[PDB]
Amino acid sequence: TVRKNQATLTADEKRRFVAAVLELKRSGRYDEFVRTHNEFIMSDTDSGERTGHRSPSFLPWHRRFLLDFEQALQSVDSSVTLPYWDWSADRTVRASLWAPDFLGGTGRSTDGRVMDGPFAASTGNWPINVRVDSRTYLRRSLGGSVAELPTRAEVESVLAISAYDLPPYNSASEGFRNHLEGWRGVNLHNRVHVWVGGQMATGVSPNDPVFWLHHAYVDKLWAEWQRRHPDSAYVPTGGTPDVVDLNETMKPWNTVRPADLLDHTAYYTFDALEHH
Amino acid sequence: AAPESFDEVYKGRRIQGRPAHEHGGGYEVFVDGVQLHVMRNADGSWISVVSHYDPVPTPRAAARAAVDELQGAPLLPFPA
Ligand SMILES: [Cu+2]
Numbered sequence: 001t002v003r004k005n006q007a008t009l010t011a012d013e014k015r016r017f018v019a020a021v022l023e024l025k026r027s028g029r030y031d032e033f034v035r036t037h038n039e040f041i042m043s044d045t046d047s048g049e050r051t052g053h054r055s056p057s058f059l060p061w062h063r064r065f066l067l068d069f070e071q072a073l074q075s076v077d078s079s080v081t082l083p084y085w086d087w088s089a090d091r092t093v094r095a096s097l098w099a100p101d102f103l104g105g106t107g108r109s110t111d112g113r114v115m116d117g118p119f120a121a122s123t124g125n126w127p128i129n130v131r132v133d134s135r136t137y138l139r140r141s142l143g144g145s146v147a148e149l150p151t152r153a154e155v156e157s158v159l160a161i162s163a164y165d166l167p168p169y170n171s172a173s174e175g176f177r178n179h180l181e182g183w184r185g186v187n188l189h190n191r192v193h194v195w196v197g198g199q200m201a202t203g204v205s206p207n208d209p210v211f212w213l214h215h216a217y218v219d220k221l222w223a224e225w226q227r228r229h230p231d232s233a234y235v236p237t238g239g240t241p242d243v244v245d246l247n248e249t250m251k252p253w254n255t256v257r258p259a260d261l262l263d264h265t266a267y268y269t270f271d272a273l274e275h276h
Numbered sequence: 277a278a279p280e281s282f283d284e285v286y287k288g289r290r291i292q293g294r295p296a297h298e299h300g301g302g303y304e305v306f307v308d309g310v311q312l313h314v315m316r317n318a319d320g321s322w323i324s325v326v327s328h329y330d331p332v333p334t335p336r337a338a339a340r341a342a343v344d345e346l347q348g349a350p351l352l353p354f355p356a
């Protein structure tokens with residue numbers, strides 16, 4: 001399974017990815033990923049139990065969540081893998097990601113409604129069901145709520161941080177995980193959510209298919225951090241209240257630990273990953 | 277200490293806040309009587325589920341960001 005930069009997909013690969021995503025939606029399987037995600041967004045807290053977000057297990061949790069989704073896509077078309085969006089490189093509304101043959105573009109100015117591409121509400125193929133804002137169409141405002149996506153220099157400054165995470169293991173932490181997540185510092189992953197806008201700015205962000213491509217690139221940046229820091233590893237490593245330690249199992253699966261997810265190559269490789 | 281309560285009409289929507297599937301949960305916000313899930317971050321900023329990735333300083337600011345997000349639309353209640 002090779003996860004490819006979205007910018008590099010062939011037209012056949014874009015077609016097959018879109019068709020597989022639309023079939024998971026039609027069959028009812030897609031929306032349960034959205035619902036699981038929002039339940040962890042609302043439950044992960046800085047002063048209580050935290051698993052999917054604002055915590056060291058943000059990275060392995062999303063790695064397993066994306067693997068579950070990729071496996072669902074491969075049950076519809078075994079050739080499909082999750083592409084990744086390098087938003088430090090493909091940083092304008094003109095990127096091919098946002099063309100009508102892939103994810104469609106930004107929302108129109110009055111209501112945020114996406115008007116083109118396969119996920120536009122007018123197609124009848126992308127109802128927004130699991131939602132908090134009651135409107136039922138995909139919305140985006142690319143660049144509307146924050147001026148710029150992160151740059152490669154900003155990504156490199158976060159990749160240089162040697163500690164994986166640090167006490168208190170939450171949104172106040174220094175260290176790599178929280179700078180990648182974006183609650184402190186120049187802000188990588190959270191700012192991308194804000195830049196897309198629409199459902200991507202909410203706890204039901206997996207309503208936009210770009211969610212998966214954003215997280216596939218966040219996941220690639222974890223793999224890049226590990227190659228840069230082969231001497232550094234997941235923390236904490238035992239007996240931490242409310243935080244998933246290295247060898248502790250993680251909800252909702254309960255049958256997998258961060259330790260089982262550190263090495264992505266057990267599951268997929270990237271088109272390119274520079275080596276250490 | 278919890279933030280103070282508030283009650284105003286913001287952009288034609290009634291927003292209310294008060295000290296009190298999702299977390300437990302020390303402050304409640306409502307938009308036209310529908311409860312909006314909100315959360316406080318360790319640095320004292322706030323977010324809501326409809327503007328989750330963009331911290332703002334106060335629960336009233338989170339309620340106002342939700343009204344801005346909704347563009348007039350009703351809020352749906354959250355599970356539980
Ligand atoms: Cu998430």
Ligand SMILES: [Cu+2]
Binds near residue numbers: 189193205215
């Ligand atoms: Cu995310």
Ligand SMILES: [Cu+2]
Binds near residue numbers: 276
């Ligand atoms: Cu070396």
Ligand SMILES: [Cu+2]
Binds near residue numbers: 042298300301313
């Ligand atoms: Cu809650």
